[PDB]
Amino acid sequence: MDIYVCTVCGYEYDPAKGDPDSGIKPGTKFEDLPDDWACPVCGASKDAFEKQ
């Protein structure tokens, strides 16, 4: 559908899950994400995630 999980740790971004600590609304495009967002889990940049 439009899910993205980190391959470093394994934290499904889930657009519906978005992010609470960072300033993200519930249901945000993974492309509209800030230009400084990074795997808030481990840290891995936004280039480690892979559509499901």
3-class secondary structure for 1-52? CCCEECCCCCCCCCCCCCCCCCCCCCCCCCCCCCCCCCCCCCCCCCCCCEEC
Cβ–Cβ < 8 Å for 4, 51: yes
Say whether 32 counts as a known binding-site residue.
no
Cβ–Cβ < 8 Å for 20, 33: no
Say whether 42 counts as a known binding-site residue.
yes
Q: Which two tokens stand for residue 29?
A: 């495009």
Note the CATH architecture for domain 1-52: Single Sheet (2.20)
Kindly list the domain boundaries of the chain, sorted by start residue: 1-52
Cβ–Cβ < 8 Å for 20, 27: no
Q: Which two tokens stand for residue 35?
A: 């230009």
Cβ–Cβ < 8 Å for 39, 6: yes
Say whether 7 counts as a known binding-site residue.
no
Cβ–Cβ < 8 Å for 46, 33: yes
